[PDB]
């Protein structure tokens, strides 16, 4: 039987070189699964507490504290439970911690176990992770949202918008879809060389040049698309993570490209681009708690584009429900480590999906070699994934895993294609 | 490995005493699963072709024809395939048949194999059917929609509306929820005795008295609710399957309670009841192809009540998509045998769920001892099921299986309760 | 038994976003191993032929050609052989190709199989890859040579020397050793910020600022070491890959920092630094075929520093033997993909090790999520590894795997420390 | 799993008829391995303490004392440990003893367990001992150094030099190599008969005639080579173990063939022979602690011949390191029982091999039916073995095991041939 028999945990380095939690689970039937926990550069206020060691080591960013929680407290608590009772294991961890924000054991320890338990469950079931999580109907390969020009907090550059990504919605398959993104990325490299701009990479592996403004970046991407013999829009669409939390002052407003601006001021600018450019998606265009601004933007342009809530929802059913009720955004960015457990994440997906909202499975600035979200994207049938550029193997590894799932699925597999966005 | 090794099929009797298809699947690892196929009394035009033998036997309702298709054609075609590649097995069956409406091998043969393969997959995975189909997050026990007064085609009575059902939305758990329905049903029995009306059962095990009109029935149910020491609405809500296809004349209109009436005429009457009674759901209030009428009813009262499409969608993504586009209804009645495969069914659920529509897993007038839909309701997290009265074990068996799933889930389990209907 | 039963191969993306070969091997005992093949940005002339597709796809850098070789030719050839007869499998592949430079099937296909077969062997033996390859005595954790400032071909910058790396020789353990490098890297980030220089990353995840000269870079690294509260030399030493092939003109000489210079000219400059800075290692200081220059440099400063042959030996026993005979260099850079097989690599290690030469296991500019070389470094007991910065998970993943091996080894484990370099 | 479950030990007779330690190890997975411990006639001062019983039995040479140590102390200490964690098991034994020279439990008990554990590890891994110890690259069959004329302490004759051996360096394979030695040995038998000299065997199974001097012996061997239709040098080379410890007086000098002589006196004589005869190797030409003499001999003739350290290094990394530093000898004679553990032995090999020194795996005057060193020679890829004459099955058994390894390896196998000695 798949009965949890051993829970070990160790400290490893994420893609930025910062420590994080890796968890290992053994079942009485000799199953061995391993899950590693990502970390965002700038984390939203309402995220689950990341338990850091503090002090001298790794500039206080150590997670030995979180590792001992797993060995000392969680292991003893879940050992004896059944690995395929995810909700019961997840509820035990949540109850063991006993805090709203998972501040006792840490979301990074809690999730470490949540994910490792899920992988062990699927190995023991002799099912690939996407098939076990999403059932036998898991088959929709997602549109890669590939962040090829990096700004905001993932770059030490003076670019305001955090992510500029390409969406090969026109591709007939994932294998072609991934080729297109790759081929556009390499094109952009040459474009940036031609214009004498920087090709040093940011955190998610996009190029980090000191472009003048938002227009200028999108123009360079469009060039790159065309240079790669693809048509902007129909073949390859555009997307943003504005991340307007990281350039919003509590109460005051948004300090954005010279002029400190209102949500309505901003809302006009975003509408402008929908005109100029082939944008299918805009994420965190306004601040985490600027609830008024989002409703107006959503009311204004929601018919015309996909609006993705990241820091406003922090993958939280509580925050998401308020959103749905107030008609804030049409899509949820899904980040396991924001909420802290797999079941809390899927509850969030389920709420969004039942509320007619789309979902986009997301990585963090600090990723590991873990490919968990690759399977999660297909399992939940989101048809959209944001796991960074076609550069840096903490991003690429997910795309490689998506290739494998597509292979495994054979004729069963369908690429979400342009069906991901009605508008 | 879970590789299909043997496919046998035989003819059995459904709950009406009519033959139907039962399928058995063996995997190379010695897994043995069995699935039986239901049949509706009056089937919608756009349903999958049920392959009947014709001739003298069982008044032409034999399925020996369909049984040989399984032995002779399907067995040889799927043997060697992997049981947990549901979509690949389902696609092979669909391609082998090679017709739009599954008229070659018959939906009843095709589905027989589709479901048996799915059950074998789950046994081999050592997972309960709901866990394998819906993943580890399957936990939402559905609200039983219990049809305790039978009219229309399930009764040889002069009652116009086909189904009158009770919805114990107020119950804290499924185990209590099922008790309430049972206790209300037995109360209604005594009420009908008191009023000297009939307690002979219809097809779905509801009482089939010759009540004057629609009002009169709902009044008797309300009595019964109150007599059982429960509060109508808050504890126990009301629901209908109008089945207005079975009393609509192509082009003319709806011959309903004396007066042949327009969709707008009808629409006024339905709105009337929402006022008089605590209705959470109304199903097939207008005809299968009366596309104009549904839009007006949906526009009119859709804010005020759940509108369920049965014969208008026949569990067909094609028909459902047109509905969503034309804003026809807010919920899909899910019937595996209308569409013909498990994967086609789940595609339909997925379309509805992504379009912000609710889903209600449904039985047929002709049911078997099969409890498949009990698991399917929890797997898809619909939170609503219509599997008939708390009488006749072709209905009860599903409720017994729902009790078992609730047990298995323990603290994980949550009863959909009043969360199934916002309004 | 561990008898090769299935060989599958697919095309994936390396860390630059370029396609490469991934191979999967199944044994009759149901073992499943996967190995992925790296690729260097600028490859030495004498490396094994990388079989590229050419044409439009991935700017001609596709490897579908190589994938079919595996499926069509290699699979049929090795299936039936014993996975733990590495030399026999490797010899079969070499003979099947039948060319000096592996130009028929491609080193990238050949090696794909060589490595996958080795991993399957170790799984079947129930041994970690390092234990199976290096026997029960494999225990020496290597000194991480961490390339934290990137120039040459891994950067679109005007820096002449390709790699600037830090060597935490003073650390008591790998776990501390990796912390030091990480902590120094993050320090350098802050230093570069302070000096207003670029922190956009190069191919191996080092910072790619447009530093004036070689001195200036080494000075910034030393700052960073000191800023991290470690002592340059005793705690953290310095190392270079000059990669003088990529700035040498056939017959003419080396175009290096303004002045086109002789091997003797260069040799004086390198000796200068040994004075100024705490350098333990200098790699490819002169050109691949500049055999005369290396002897003089080796004669001149070989007593004073470790000289590492990369492109001069291309992991080739043939090239290495000439070197040993002519007393060219004191160390071999080991790259599996230069030579094409695991056994050819180990022959090369064995020649070097028996000739009193040290060995440094190396990655490529294009790496995958594969951690194979992490195990290989410990198995061969080199005590030195170059797998890039503590940034980008195609580098970090190896360091994470080295942490795991150190854990597994417990008290058995010894960190090579300052014992890696006598001088 | 390969977890040590039982350690039994018993007293057996070596090839001289003296008791020694035999150890048996059982793993929880029902693996059964047996290792027997050799003993040298005259042991170097710096060897590990051989724990002898003393008293009446076997003239005090009993090892019941050592057997009880295994049963009473070591068994309980290592039971529960993992057999393939050699270094951890070896370190436990070393720590349990807790003395520099293994004088508490005895090297003969300690090693008994060290070797038995290693064999059990390899059985459980389902790998031949050479493959498990040396990894998949173990393939180099060693040159047999066959001691066919015995003097010194292995003979009750008046011959000064201890070993006169033949080296079939010219052979194309081990199977031919062993034939040549055998055929030369039988030839020497006939030569000795012709000259009316003795053919009674010494301890290692070489002929023990009372030859006049060192020249006279080498002349008889050369005759024998030629009589066997092989060419001295190119086909069959010559080698000595001078064993100058057993004819050196502390402080005074070496009493050798009439004249008590200086290290420089001796050094001239050895140089003389290199001229007269085809010698590839000379072992313990000077005394164990005569550190000055070895440096001069090594400086003098080290370019011209292989110098093997036996009693000077006693297979001790400590003693070997001093040697390497002082440039004493170019090769290490490897004897497991001198150092006391397999891991301490391999550390010694590793030091020598990384210092550019060759290694020769050696037996003892007192050998058992054990063939362990046959595998060890191939695992460490020494390409040289000294396991005595082609007579007496305590020698021959090793050659028979080398034949089997060569068979197993097939085309993988390479005979070290004349590649063992550059000079
Ligand atoms: O803004 C976001 O969506 C994420 C990137 O996936 O940012 P961070 O990981 O820094 O929280
Ligand atoms: O109208 C319906 O929903 C069904 C009852 O489940 O009717 P029939 O089975 O007769 O098609
Ligand atoms: O020069 C080197 O050693 C390598 C980096 O490991 O370079 P490339 O991978 O580009 O050949
Ligand atoms: O001198 C030696 O090398 C050995 C023989 O292998 O001698 P003894 O076994 O007597 O120590
Ligand atoms: Mg954001
Ligand atoms: Mg109906
Ligand atoms: Mg180089
Ligand atoms: Mg000796």
CSV table of N, CA and C in Angstrom, one decimal, chain A residues 84-88 91 124-128 131-140 342-344 346-347 350 352-358 380-382 408-414, chain B residues 84-88 91 124-128 131-140 342-344 346-347 350 352-358 380-382 408-414:
chain,number,residue,atom,x,y,z
A,84,UNK,N,-2.2,8.8,-1.1
A,84,UNK,CA,-3.2,9.1,-2.2
A,84,UNK,C,-4.4,9.8,-1.6
A,85,UNK,N,-4.4,10.0,-0.2
A,85,UNK,CA,-5.4,10.8,0.5
A,85,UNK,C,-4.8,12.2,0.6
A,86,UNK,N,-4.6,12.9,-0.5
A,86,UNK,CA,-3.8,14.2,-0.6
A,86,UNK,C,-4.5,15.2,0.4
A,87,UNK,N,-5.8,15.4,0.3
A,87,UNK,CA,-6.6,16.4,1.1
A,87,UNK,C,-6.4,16.1,2.6
A,88,UNK,N,-6.3,14.8,3.0
A,88,UNK,CA,-6.2,14.4,4.4
A,88,UNK,C,-4.7,14.7,4.9
A,91,UNK,N,-4.4,18.6,4.9
A,91,UNK,CA,-5.2,19.1,6.1
A,91,UNK,C,-4.4,18.9,7.4
A,124,UNK,N,3.5,5.2,-7.1
A,124,UNK,CA,2.8,4.0,-6.5
A,124,UNK,C,1.6,3.5,-7.3
A,125,UNK,N,0.9,4.5,-7.8
A,125,UNK,CA,-0.3,4.3,-8.8
A,125,UNK,C,0.2,3.8,-10.1
A,126,UNK,N,1.6,3.9,-10.4
A,126,UNK,CA,2.2,3.7,-11.7
A,126,UNK,C,1.6,4.6,-12.7
A,127,UNK,N,1.4,5.8,-12.4
A,127,UNK,CA,0.8,6.9,-13.3
A,127,UNK,C,1.7,8.1,-13.4
A,128,UNK,N,1.9,8.7,-14.6
A,128,UNK,CA,2.6,9.9,-14.7
A,128,UNK,C,1.9,11.0,-13.9
A,131,UNK,N,-1.3,12.5,-15.1
A,131,UNK,CA,-2.4,11.5,-15.2
A,131,UNK,C,-3.1,11.3,-13.8
A,132,UNK,N,-2.2,11.1,-12.8
A,132,UNK,CA,-2.7,10.9,-11.4
A,132,UNK,C,-3.5,12.1,-10.9
A,133,UNK,N,-3.0,13.3,-11.1
A,133,UNK,CA,-3.5,14.6,-10.5
A,133,UNK,C,-4.8,14.9,-11.3
A,134,UNK,N,-4.8,14.8,-12.6
A,134,UNK,CA,-5.8,15.3,-13.5
A,134,UNK,C,-6.7,14.2,-14.1
A,135,UNK,N,-6.5,13.0,-13.7
A,135,UNK,CA,-7.2,11.8,-14.1
A,135,UNK,C,-6.9,11.4,-15.6
A,136,UNK,N,-7.6,10.5,-16.2
A,136,UNK,CA,-7.3,9.9,-17.5
A,136,UNK,C,-7.6,10.9,-18.6
A,137,UNK,N,-8.3,12.0,-18.3
A,137,UNK,CA,-8.7,13.0,-19.3
A,137,UNK,C,-7.7,14.1,-19.5
A,138,UNK,N,-6.7,14.2,-18.6
A,138,UNK,CA,-5.6,15.2,-18.7
A,138,UNK,C,-4.9,15.0,-20.1
A,139,UNK,N,-4.9,16.0,-20.9
A,139,UNK,CA,-4.4,15.8,-22.3
A,139,UNK,C,-4.1,17.2,-23.0
A,140,UNK,N,-4.6,18.3,-22.4
A,140,UNK,CA,-4.4,19.7,-23.1
A,140,UNK,C,-3.0,20.2,-22.8
A,342,UNK,N,-0.9,21.6,-2.4
A,342,UNK,CA,-1.5,21.1,-3.7
A,342,UNK,C,-3.0,21.2,-3.7
A,343,UNK,N,-3.6,20.8,-2.6
A,343,UNK,CA,-5.1,20.7,-2.5
A,343,UNK,C,-5.7,22.1,-2.4
A,344,UNK,N,-5.0,23.0,-1.7
A,344,UNK,CA,-5.4,24.5,-1.6
A,344,UNK,C,-5.3,25.1,-3.0
A,346,UNK,N,-5.5,23.4,-6.0
A,346,UNK,CA,-6.6,22.8,-6.8
A,346,UNK,C,-7.9,23.4,-6.4
A,347,UNK,N,-8.2,23.6,-5.2
A,347,UNK,CA,-9.4,24.3,-4.7
A,347,UNK,C,-9.5,25.6,-5.4
A,350,UNK,N,-10.3,25.2,-9.1
A,350,UNK,CA,-11.7,24.7,-9.1
A,350,UNK,C,-12.6,25.9,-8.9
A,352,UNK,N,-11.9,29.2,-9.5
A,352,UNK,CA,-11.7,30.0,-10.7
A,352,UNK,C,-12.5,29.4,-11.9
A,353,UNK,N,-12.2,28.1,-12.1
A,353,UNK,CA,-12.8,27.3,-13.3
A,353,UNK,C,-14.3,27.3,-13.3
A,354,UNK,N,-14.9,27.1,-12.1
A,354,UNK,CA,-16.3,27.1,-11.8
A,354,UNK,C,-16.9,28.5,-11.9
A,355,UNK,N,-16.1,29.5,-11.7
A,355,UNK,CA,-16.5,30.9,-11.8
A,355,UNK,C,-16.3,31.5,-13.3
A,356,UNK,N,-16.0,30.6,-14.2
A,356,UNK,CA,-15.7,30.9,-15.6
A,356,UNK,C,-14.4,31.7,-15.9
A,357,UNK,N,-13.5,31.7,-14.9
A,357,UNK,CA,-12.2,32.3,-15.0
A,357,UNK,C,-11.2,31.3,-15.6
A,358,UNK,N,-10.2,31.8,-16.4
A,358,UNK,CA,-9.1,30.9,-16.9
A,358,UNK,C,-8.0,30.9,-15.9
A,380,UNK,N,-4.6,20.1,-14.8
A,380,UNK,CA,-5.7,21.1,-14.5
A,380,UNK,C,-6.3,21.6,-15.8
A,381,UNK,N,-5.7,21.2,-17.0
A,381,UNK,CA,-6.1,21.5,-18.3
A,381,UNK,C,-6.3,23.0,-18.5
A,382,UNK,N,-5.4,23.8,-17.9
A,382,UNK,CA,-5.3,25.3,-18.0
A,382,UNK,C,-5.1,25.8,-19.4
A,408,UNK,N,4.0,11.0,-24.7
A,408,UNK,CA,3.2,10.0,-24.0
A,408,UNK,C,1.8,9.9,-24.4
A,409,UNK,N,1.2,11.1,-24.6
A,409,UNK,CA,-0.3,11.3,-24.9
A,409,UNK,C,-0.5,10.8,-26.4
A,410,UNK,N,0.4,11.0,-27.2
A,410,UNK,CA,0.3,10.7,-28.7
A,410,UNK,C,-0.8,11.4,-29.3
A,411,UNK,N,-1.8,10.7,-30.0
A,411,UNK,CA,-2.9,11.3,-30.7
A,411,UNK,C,-3.9,11.9,-29.7
A,412,UNK,N,-3.9,11.4,-28.4
A,412,UNK,CA,-4.8,11.9,-27.3
A,412,UNK,C,-4.5,13.4,-27.1
A,413,UNK,N,-3.2,13.8,-27.1
A,413,UNK,CA,-2.8,15.2,-26.8
A,413,UNK,C,-3.5,16.1,-27.8
A,414,UNK,N,-3.9,17.3,-27.2
A,414,UNK,CA,-4.4,18.4,-28.1
A,414,UNK,C,-3.7,19.7,-27.5
B,84,UNK,N,-5.3,2.9,-19.3
B,84,UNK,CA,-5.2,4.2,-18.6
B,84,UNK,C,-4.9,5.3,-19.7
B,85,UNK,N,-4.8,4.9,-20.9
B,85,UNK,CA,-4.9,5.9,-22.1
B,85,UNK,C,-6.3,6.0,-22.5
B,86,UNK,N,-7.2,6.5,-21.7
B,86,UNK,CA,-8.7,6.5,-21.9
B,86,UNK,C,-9.0,7.2,-23.3
B,87,UNK,N,-8.5,8.4,-23.5
B,87,UNK,CA,-8.7,9.2,-24.7
B,87,UNK,C,-8.3,8.4,-26.0
B,88,UNK,N,-7.2,7.7,-25.9
B,88,UNK,CA,-6.7,6.9,-27.1
B,88,UNK,C,-7.6,5.7,-27.3
B,91,UNK,N,-10.9,7.2,-28.6
B,91,UNK,CA,-10.7,7.7,-30.0
B,91,UNK,C,-10.7,6.5,-31.0
B,124,UNK,N,-6.4,-1.4,-11.5
B,124,UNK,CA,-5.0,-1.7,-11.8
B,124,UNK,C,-4.1,-0.6,-11.1
B,125,UNK,N,-4.6,0.7,-11.1
B,125,UNK,CA,-4.0,1.8,-10.4
B,125,UNK,C,-4.2,1.7,-8.9
B,126,UNK,N,-5.0,0.7,-8.4
B,126,UNK,CA,-5.4,0.4,-7.0
B,126,UNK,C,-6.0,1.7,-6.5
B,127,UNK,N,-6.8,2.4,-7.2
B,127,UNK,CA,-7.5,3.6,-6.8
B,127,UNK,C,-9.0,3.4,-7.0
B,128,UNK,N,-9.9,4.0,-6.1
B,128,UNK,CA,-11.3,4.0,-6.3
B,128,UNK,C,-11.6,4.8,-7.5
B,131,UNK,N,-11.4,8.5,-7.5
B,131,UNK,CA,-10.0,9.1,-7.3
B,131,UNK,C,-9.2,9.0,-8.6
B,132,UNK,N,-9.4,7.9,-9.3
B,132,UNK,CA,-8.6,7.7,-10.6
B,132,UNK,C,-9.1,8.7,-11.6
B,133,UNK,N,-10.4,8.9,-11.8
B,133,UNK,CA,-11.1,9.8,-12.8
B,133,UNK,C,-10.8,11.2,-12.5
B,134,UNK,N,-11.0,11.6,-11.2
B,134,UNK,CA,-11.0,13.0,-10.7
B,134,UNK,C,-9.8,13.4,-10.0
B,135,UNK,N,-8.8,12.5,-9.9
B,135,UNK,CA,-7.5,12.8,-9.3
B,135,UNK,C,-7.6,12.8,-7.7
B,136,UNK,N,-6.6,13.2,-7.0
B,136,UNK,CA,-6.6,13.1,-5.5
B,136,UNK,C,-7.5,14.2,-4.9
B,137,UNK,N,-7.9,15.1,-5.7
B,137,UNK,CA,-8.7,16.3,-5.2
B,137,UNK,C,-10.2,16.0,-5.2
B,138,UNK,N,-10.6,14.9,-5.9
B,138,UNK,CA,-12.0,14.5,-5.9
B,138,UNK,C,-12.5,14.3,-4.4
B,139,UNK,N,-13.4,15.1,-3.9
B,139,UNK,CA,-13.9,15.1,-2.5
B,139,UNK,C,-15.3,15.6,-2.3
B,140,UNK,N,-15.8,16.3,-3.3
B,140,UNK,CA,-17.2,17.1,-3.1
B,140,UNK,C,-18.3,16.0,-3.3
B,342,UNK,N,-16.7,8.1,-22.2
B,342,UNK,CA,-16.3,8.8,-20.9
B,342,UNK,C,-15.5,10.1,-21.3
B,343,UNK,N,-14.6,10.0,-22.2
B,343,UNK,CA,-13.8,11.2,-22.6
B,343,UNK,C,-14.6,12.3,-23.2
B,344,UNK,N,-15.5,11.9,-24.1
B,344,UNK,CA,-16.5,12.8,-24.8
B,344,UNK,C,-17.3,13.5,-23.6
B,346,UNK,N,-16.4,13.9,-20.4
B,346,UNK,CA,-15.6,14.8,-19.6
B,346,UNK,C,-15.2,16.1,-20.4
B,347,UNK,N,-15.0,16.0,-21.7
B,347,UNK,CA,-14.8,17.1,-22.6
B,347,UNK,C,-16.0,18.1,-22.4
B,350,UNK,N,-15.9,19.7,-19.0
B,350,UNK,CA,-14.8,20.7,-19.1
B,350,UNK,C,-15.3,21.9,-19.8
B,352,UNK,N,-18.5,23.0,-20.2
B,352,UNK,CA,-19.5,23.6,-19.4
B,352,UNK,C,-18.8,24.4,-18.2
B,353,UNK,N,-17.9,23.7,-17.5
B,353,UNK,CA,-17.2,24.1,-16.3
B,353,UNK,C,-16.3,25.4,-16.6
B,354,UNK,N,-15.6,25.4,-17.8
B,354,UNK,CA,-14.8,26.5,-18.2
B,354,UNK,C,-15.6,27.6,-18.7
B,355,UNK,N,-16.9,27.4,-19.1
B,355,UNK,CA,-17.9,28.4,-19.6
B,355,UNK,C,-18.7,28.9,-18.4
B,356,UNK,N,-18.3,28.6,-17.2
B,356,UNK,CA,-19.0,29.0,-15.9
B,356,UNK,C,-20.4,28.4,-15.7
B,357,UNK,N,-20.7,27.3,-16.5
B,357,UNK,CA,-21.9,26.5,-16.3
B,357,UNK,C,-21.7,25.4,-15.2
B,358,UNK,N,-22.8,25.1,-14.4
B,358,UNK,CA,-22.8,24.0,-13.5
B,358,UNK,C,-23.1,22.7,-14.2
B,380,UNK,N,-15.8,14.6,-11.0
B,380,UNK,CA,-16.0,15.9,-11.7
B,380,UNK,C,-16.4,17.0,-10.8
B,381,UNK,N,-16.6,16.7,-9.5
B,381,UNK,CA,-16.9,17.7,-8.5
B,381,UNK,C,-18.1,18.6,-8.8
B,382,UNK,N,-19.1,18.0,-9.4
B,382,UNK,CA,-20.4,18.7,-9.9
B,382,UNK,C,-21.1,19.2,-8.7
B,408,UNK,N,-14.8,6.7,2.9
B,408,UNK,CA,-13.4,6.6,2.4
B,408,UNK,C,-12.7,8.0,2.6
B,409,UNK,N,-13.4,9.1,2.2
B,409,UNK,CA,-12.8,10.4,2.2
B,409,UNK,C,-12.6,10.9,3.6
B,410,UNK,N,-13.4,10.5,4.6
B,410,UNK,CA,-13.3,10.9,6.0
B,410,UNK,C,-13.5,12.4,6.1
B,411,UNK,N,-12.5,13.1,6.8
B,411,UNK,CA,-12.5,14.6,7.0
B,411,UNK,C,-12.3,15.3,5.7
B,412,UNK,N,-11.6,14.6,4.7
B,412,UNK,CA,-11.4,15.2,3.4
B,412,UNK,C,-12.7,15.6,2.7
B,413,UNK,N,-13.7,14.7,2.8
B,413,UNK,CA,-15.1,14.9,2.2
B,413,UNK,C,-15.7,16.2,2.6
B,414,UNK,N,-16.3,16.9,1.6
B,414,UNK,CA,-17.1,18.1,1.9
B,414,UNK,C,-18.4,17.9,1.1
